[PDB]
Amino acid sequence: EMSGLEVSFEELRTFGGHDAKFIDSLQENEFRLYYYNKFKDVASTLNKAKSIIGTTASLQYMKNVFKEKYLLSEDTSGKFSVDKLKFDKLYKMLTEIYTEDNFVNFFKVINRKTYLNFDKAVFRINIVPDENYTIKDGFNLKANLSTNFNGQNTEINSRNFTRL
Amino acid sequence: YEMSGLEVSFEELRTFGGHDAKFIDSLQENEFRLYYYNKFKDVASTLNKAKSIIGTTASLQYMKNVFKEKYLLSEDTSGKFSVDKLKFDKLYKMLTEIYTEDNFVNFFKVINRKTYLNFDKAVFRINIVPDENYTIKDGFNLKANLSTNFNGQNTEINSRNFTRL
Amino acid sequence: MAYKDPVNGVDIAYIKIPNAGQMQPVKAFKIHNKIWVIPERDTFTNPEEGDLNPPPEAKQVPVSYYDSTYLSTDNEKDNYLKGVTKLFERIYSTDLGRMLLTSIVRGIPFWGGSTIDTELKVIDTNCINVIQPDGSYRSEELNLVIIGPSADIIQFECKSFGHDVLNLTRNGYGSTQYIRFSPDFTFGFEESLGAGKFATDPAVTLAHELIHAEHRLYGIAINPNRVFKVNTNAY
Amino acid sequence: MAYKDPVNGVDIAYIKIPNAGQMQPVKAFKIHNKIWVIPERDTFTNPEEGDLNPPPEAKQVPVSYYDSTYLSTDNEKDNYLKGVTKLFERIYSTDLGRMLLTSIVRGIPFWGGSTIDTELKVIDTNCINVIQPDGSYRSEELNLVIIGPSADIIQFECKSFGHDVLNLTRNGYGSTQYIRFSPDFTFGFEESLGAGKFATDPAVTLAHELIHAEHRLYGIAINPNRVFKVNTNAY
Ligand SMILES: [Zn+2]
Ligand SMILES: [Zn+2]
């Protein structure tokens, strides 16, 4: 056994950023083709359905919800199919665009740089009060808690973090 | 069902030092130290049993003195060696916690990885003999502005010194 | 919404989880279309986790934390509901978060429950039973539940009810997801003598669980047991 | 010293390595008491590595580099010898390095070769055969040899000859170490749009290998096969 990492495909893709590079192009492509075939099987199941069970919705309604979910194409006869380019865009959105690393950048917070976490420090917090945490700025409110992520610093903004 | 995490070696963690040395728990650290203290006692005992030497390259007194110096053995008036617990602990600490990669980075004042684990693929050809490239005193960060922000080690800024393989 | 707001059977109600055997109804809040919040410790979705006591054998992780009283009073449940809703609003306040939440809402578990290919039928485990003001109940489809942690209070995760034996989370169908989460705790990490001690913003933690949830709702998640080794450059 | 300097049988000589079967003598330089430098690719210290070709099955590491011509000419061997000597001077220029190098010189492999308890005897593999001007040889104890890399040119390591089957590196005795190293290459790493692309200072790499060597010379190394798992805080 060598030294190194033990990592999960699902975690690496969910965190994104730098770690996503540990999944090789081949495996990325194999996964994508696999799920493209799963989506085609959903389109095929929909196309066979001519009636709907239960009274909670009409078939047309339910078919439309799944055309919208999977971004299926529909021809003039009502048959669905999976368009490769629409699939690729959606699959990219769901596995490479929606990532923890991308949200860090949108929130403009300081965070870990990998999903792996060996820290032991855990804190009780209280985010309901706007004096502690806002929708707009999180802990880094606009006192000097908005510079150098001081709102996230557990020493500087110690009142907001009680160690367990 | 296997978890995510690290697969790490005691020898590497202790050699690199710094933050990674914390992955070895106190218990294991103590168990290794006692084990090597017992090995040192076995060397001292082997020396005390030896009353002659094989070969003509050295005398027995010379060899005993060299190993008394190596292992910092105490020697009573009859010439018997023993291992002093406090001298051992200081030596064991020097060798396993003072001499570390992390402590060298700090002395050289270079920028370096923060863990022994390395997954990089970038490797460069370098030429350190020329003092215009790399010095004993300063490494690549010579006193042009190669001495600020580790620019001497920056492969873009000091690109002449690093040719990617 | 506040925890003490009266039930209406529509967005505030006592509910039961299908397959959660003999459970007493728990109060739940539909904070948005297809997404509900249940301010209770999760003793329901794992048949092997029916109580809040520490495990016989200690979990092999860096840190865990037990307190069978956490999330037991109305005041704590109000604060949990308000904290979770505030994190949703924070995610929704970003373009990326609005996109992700829209994808979640559209990600209705596929109706793959028919054994006859000419009929389309729901998979009834992608539902919750919502008790009405008159005491009757209605089976309602949902995509996502945010629920309090189980015994280990700082263990957050996205899971199906029980285990995904039918591979709905990996076959394109998708299934209703449960995120065990608490907005009342957060992990610390070291970064940058001069090593600053920081805390993870819980909106990022929630977003991570929401990402797992969308993979699992679209049936494109990769089995969490699929792990591989990456060797180091030894020296 | 320069590569073309004439032999004297004392600090510049052609040498052979004990147990390195039918090897042709190689030119070696004693840059300090107990420490030699051999500007040759290491086809000697691993019986299973007798040439410089890439392995049949690719090594499972992030990066490897093969070039059977590297370190084959006098020029390259002069530059290698001078590069290593300069890195030793850099380490020695620090208080920590001066201490480390002193500990290495004092760390003579124990004379634990005797099967008779009243007699002290050398372990004859802790030596090298030093060819003299007259063609004779002298078996000389040494502590450390810095030698060029084997087939993979960027693989640096501290090793015994072959494998440590008597456990001399871990039983308090110690044994002669060989550091496979090249001052001609160095790895990059990313740090701090604003991610700096930096290179490891080879003196640090050499220091890391010297740290392995001192563990192994004092017989307090831990087996490199002794690895353990550290689980992550999953979420
Ligand atoms: Zn090492
Ligand atoms: Zn995760």
B12 Cβ partners below 8 Å, 6+ apart? A3, B20, B116, D224
With H, G, I as helix, E, B as strand and everything else as coil, classify residue B71: helix
D82 Cβ partners below 8 Å, 6+ apart? B129, D2
Q: What is the DSSP string of B102-159?
A: HHHHHHHT----SSS------EEE---SSTTT-BTTTBT------SSTTGGGBTTTTG
User: CA C218 to CA A70: how far, in whole Å?
Assistant: 8
Helices (H), chain C: 74-92, 95-106, 202-217
Residue D98 sits at φ, ψ, to 5 deg, of -60, -40
Mutate to test the interface with B, among D198, D214, D232, D233 (most CBs of B within 10 A): D198
User: CA A112 to CA D94: how far, in whole Å?
Assistant: 34
Residues C154 and C187 sit within 8 Å (Cβ to Cβ): yes
CATH code for the domain in which residue C227 is found: 3.90.1240.10
| Closest C-alpha to A118, from D227, C61, C207 | C61
- C233 lies within 8 A of chain B by CB: yes
DSSP single-letter state for residue A93 = I
Tokens standing for residue A160: 């907001």
Tokens standing for residue D32: 């300090």
CB neighbourhood size of C150 (10 A): 19
**Fold type of domain B111-165:** Metalloproteases ("zincins"), catalytic domain fold (4.10.1280)
Tokens standing for residue D181: 């190293």
Architecture of domain B8-110: Up-down Bundle (1.20)
Q: Can you give the residue ranges of every domain in chain B? A: 8-110, 111-165
Residues linked to residue C157 through DSSP beta bridges, in sequence order:
C180
Residues D86 and D97 sit within 8 Å (Cβ to Cβ): no
DSSP single-letter state for residue A81 = E
Tokens 């919800």 belong to which residue? Answer: A65
Q: What is the DSSP string of C128-140?
A: EEEE-TTS-EEEE
Residues D46 and D40 sit within 8 Å (Cβ to Cβ): no
Interchain proximity B116–C232, CB inside 8 Å: yes
User: CA C135 to CA C138: how far, in whole Å?
Assistant: 10
CB neighbourhood size of D55 (10 A): 11
The H or E element spanning position A73 is strand A73-74
User: CA B163 to CA D4: how far, in whole Å?
Assistant: 28
User: CA D15 to CA D28: how far, in whole Å?
Assistant: 7
Dihedral of CA C223/C226/C227/C228: which sign? negative
Note which residues in 59-98 of chain A have CB less than 8 A from chain B.
Answer: none
Domain count, chain C: 1
Q: How was this structure determined?
A: X-ray
User: CA A107 to CA C9: how far, in whole Å?
Assistant: 35
Residues B103 and D96 sit within 8 Å (Cβ to Cβ): yes
User: CA D139 to CA A84: how far, in whole Å?
Assistant: 73
Mutate to test the interface with D, among C182, C191, C233 (most CBs of D within 10 A): C233
Tokens standing for residue B32: 């290794």
Residues A3 and C232 sit within 8 Å (Cβ to Cβ): yes
Residue C229 sits at φ, ψ, to 5 deg, of -100, 140
- How many Å lie between the centroid of ligand 1 and the Cα of residue A52? 65
CA geometry: angle A115, A120, A125, nearest 5 deg: 90
The H or E element spanning position A114 is none
CA A93 to chain centre: 9
| Closest C-alpha to D81, from D159, D173, D11 | D11
| Closest C-alpha to B96, from B14, B8, B12 | B14
Dihedral of CA D158/D163/D165/D166: which sign? negative
User: CA B35 to CA B39: how far, in whole Å?
Assistant: 6
- Rounded to a whole number of angstroms, the distance from the CA of A76 to the nearest CA of chain B is 49
Tokens standing for residue C122: 């729901």
Residues D98 and B99 sit within 8 Å (Cβ to Cβ): no
Residues C196 and A62 sit within 8 Å (Cβ to Cβ): no
DSSP single-letter state for residue C177 = E
Q: Amino acid identity, residue B73?
A: L
The strand ranges marked E within C133-183 are: 137-141, 144-148, 157-159, 177-180
Tokens standing for residue C127: 């539902």
Tokens 């500087």 belong to which residue? Answer: A156
Rg of chain A over Cα atoms, rounded to whole angstroms, equals 23
User: CA A39 to CA A33: how far, in whole Å?
Assistant: 10
Tokens standing for residue D5: 């300097």
Residues C39 and C71 sit within 8 Å (Cβ to Cβ): yes
Burial of residue A55 (CB within 10 Å: 0-12, 13-18, 19+) is exposed
Question: Which residues of C fall within a CB distance of 8 Å from B2?
Answer: 225, 227
| Closest C-alpha to D204, from D218, D189, D222, D223 | D189
CATH number of A7-109: 1.20.58.540
Interchain proximity C186–A123, CB inside 8 Å: yes
**Three-state secondary structure string covering D68-88:** CCCCCCHHHHHHHHHHHHHHH
Q: Which one of 3.40.50.1000, 3.30.420.40, 3.40.50.720, 4.10.1280.10 gives the CATH number of domain A110-164?
A: 4.10.1280.10
User: CA A155 to CA C197: how far, in whole Å?
Assistant: 7
Active site positions of C, annotated? 209
Active site positions of D, annotated? 209
Burial of residue D27 (CB within 10 Å: 0-12, 13-18, 19+) is buried
User: CA B19 to CA B13: how far, in whole Å?
Assistant: 9
User: CA C187 to CA B136: how far, in whole Å?
Assistant: 43
User: CA A138 to CA A107: how far, in whole Å?
Assistant: 8
Domain that holds residue D99: 1-235
User: CA C35 to CA B56: how far, in whole Å?
Assistant: 87
Residues linked to residue B163 through DSSP beta bridges, in sequence order:
B125
Q: Which residues in D have their CB inside 8 Å of a CB on C? A: 60-63, 155-157, 187, 205, 208-209, 230-235
Residue C154 sits at φ, ψ, to 5 deg, of -105, 15
Residues D149 and D42 sit within 8 Å (Cβ to Cβ): yes
**How big is the A-D interface in CB pairs under 8 Å?**
16
CB neighbourhood size of C200 (10 A): 23
